[PDB]
Symmetry: C3
Subunit: 299 residues, 3 copies
């Protein structure tokens, strides 16, 4: 194609650990790069941008969808993957990975493992999940999905639904959206015990007030949440937060249902055939955003 | 090119020996052989650069997935691993988001049809319970062709656990439907005999082509003297609930109710021009004493397997 | 290119099972090839030397470090890896024949010492021994020697301590053989209790080399001041899996200014993290030298 693939220069050589490290301009640059990669790959073009570069996982907890998304992205850039399964100190493991790798993709059940990893690593680390902390590449792919499906991120009303306390995806997404866009409204839908934590909401208070972002907490998918949301973004944790075909009769015509996956019965299979079910297409947007990120980091 | 893809396989899932015609089988054979000549001469092929194969192995066999991996790599393709360690449909959709071809192995026989109804890219059935193993039948037939020269006219013994042997299920279908086989010996204890749901759909073609079918429970002198191909198999213990008395009887019958071991002594009765085959892996049914015999084709079979898998992958994805 | 990256011709098509199979010339040829590989990879050059060739690991015991090192090395030569995992009653020989039907090279690690010889009797393609019980680890010995050469500038004339479980340690078995057979080693310290000492079946065959080059060998139970003061290389290993063998910042005050501490890894408390910031701590650099030595080996085997 006549499209080019300029890497996002601000990401060069950088570790990706938080949604906080991206500007609005970084995000759009990554969206447009991901979209151009999508067009080339879908036309059958073979990219050889990262020939001879190695990605290695550091997955102290398992996620085949995550791991495989990253490997596929690296491979479609012409890069290669070396496996390193854990089942020795984290520091020694990291130094070992650094001896042969160009980029590390780390997932860890401890939230602070990223900081320790960063202090010894010589190559960029991409955070693929640090306990209940963040999942910054998921936030970026989630935002690509919103943009590609609805045409706009500014002005949206989004429901964040499920285990908001322990959901690292909703943490990164709220941060990324509120910091960089003019979000109209965020419904935070969860049982009181699993509400969105204060250590996510407080740093955002200034931006929320300045931009006039409306935050409403509920413990249920009310008819209001269903009638006003452009995006229903749901996660694993009962009948009052479930999205099924019956509940979808209240939804706008123009909206999407998203879910980072895996799901349980908070997202019924009765929704899967609805055009508005975006949660499978989300994963494909995932591959392309990850391609954009990797190329930008390693260019 | 030297390597024209088999046009009828373009974009299609490979699930049963029944989907292939005689012409398809010969086109794949000649493509596999052409690939073998190029690979053995040291040529690098770049036909599937940028394409991804991924597993969907719900019973595992790093053994079988690795043979498909090697084929993909020798076509210039790439591999992404997926560990099943969530619904079957959601898993498929996940692999579909990033892959070009899925290679699926599953303990349930009906999981393939479920997969097919949600999958967007081709699925290669690498084994569905005691159902089928279609690519094994293709590579087996390539082996017969390359080693003996002709498939029509052969006398073939299918030996061992024919009840649970997905290999012999696929192979019997592929041979009877597409070739004129002289005689099939079904050599097994009664408890592990070839199932009715394989034999009955083939009854019309068996009759119409005048294929001789004989059941035995032993490698008798007649079987040893007449067979061009002795195709033997492992007892599928994984398919048997050891604790139940039915399954313990089926288990025991392999040694207790049949005389079916191939060793060097038994091979003194074989023809000069024949081959011994086994899909592998094996246990004691096929003695290591046979391995030195020039008629022992079961290692060469795996090499033919690589090239047949390359022929199939290139044809599916071209 | 035969100018920049000439393969070591002696290794063409050959399985690598023991440190004993290499000459001094082979080792320097591998060292110079490994350094040239390093220069190109570090400058960002992409190698296409082994495009279309397949390395298959066959690891009957785990080692993410040894496994990933070989995989990285194959990939950086442009080669490919088939990710076979061990874990129906299939034998070792049949597993080997299976991998052999589609591979160009096998990399085998196994808890039984004799498994390598059984594999070699059936394999048609070269097998690289990545560790055979308490026998040998020949590619570790090679990368260890590259590490010494590169860090200190010379292998001839060094004083080296081999520390830890010398009885069961496959890395120290291969290293001692490779060094004494092919270099004029000044002095070897074998630092271990008698129960875990260097085996007699490693020392006895080196008798001729020890006499002919006048190599000094002393046993100690502990890491004495003398060992610390005279050693150019301190090569340590896990004592189990730790009485008076620990290297820490305090012990290092006794070391020469110019020397290196090495460890094939993983480590327990025999090598304190307090040493990690020292310029003499070469045990992380050692792993990177490993990749490049494995590149020189793979290229030489398969060219
Ligand atoms: N490997 C073949 C035969 C066997 O396992 O015995 C199969 O997967 O069906």
């Amino acid at each position: 194609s006549m499209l080019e693939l300029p890497p996002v220069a601000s990401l060069k050589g950088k570790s990706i650990t938080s949604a906080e490290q991206f500007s609005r301009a970084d995000i759009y640059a990554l969206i447009h790069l991901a979209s151009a990669m999508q067009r080339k790959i879908d036309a059958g073009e073979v990219l050889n941008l990262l020939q001879g570069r190695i990605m290695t996982p550091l997955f102290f907890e398992d996620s085949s969808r995550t791991f495989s998304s990253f490997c596929a992205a690296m491979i479609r850039l012409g890069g290669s993957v070396v496996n390193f399964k854990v089942e020795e100190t984290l520091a020694d493991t990291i130094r070992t990975l650094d001896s042969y790798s160009d980029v590390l993709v780390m997932r860890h059940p401890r939230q602070d493992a990223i900081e320790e990893a960063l202090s010894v690593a010589q190559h960029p680390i991409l955070n693929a999940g640090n306990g209940a902390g963040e999942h910054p590449t998921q936030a970026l792919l989630d935002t690509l999905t919103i943009h590609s499906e609805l045409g706009s991120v500014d002005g949206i009303t989004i429901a964040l639904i499920g285990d908001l306390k322990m959901g690292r995806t909703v943490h990164s997404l709220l941060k990324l959206l509120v910091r960089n866009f003019s979000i109209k409204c965020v419904f935070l839908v969860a049982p009181d015990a699993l509400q969105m934590p204060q250590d996510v909401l407080e740093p955002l208070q200034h931006e929320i007030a300045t931009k006039g972002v409306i935050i409403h907490r509920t413990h249920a998918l009310t008819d209001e949440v269903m009638q006003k949301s452009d995006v229903l973004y749901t996660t694993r944790l009962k009948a009052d937060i479930t999205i099924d075909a019956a509940r979808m009769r209240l939804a706008k015509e123009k909206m999407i249902v998203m879910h980072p996956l895996p799901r349980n019965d908070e997202l019924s299979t009765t929704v899967d055939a609805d055009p508005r079910a975006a949660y499978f297409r989300q994963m494909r947007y995932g591959m392309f955003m990850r391609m954009a990120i990797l190329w930008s980091v390693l260019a």
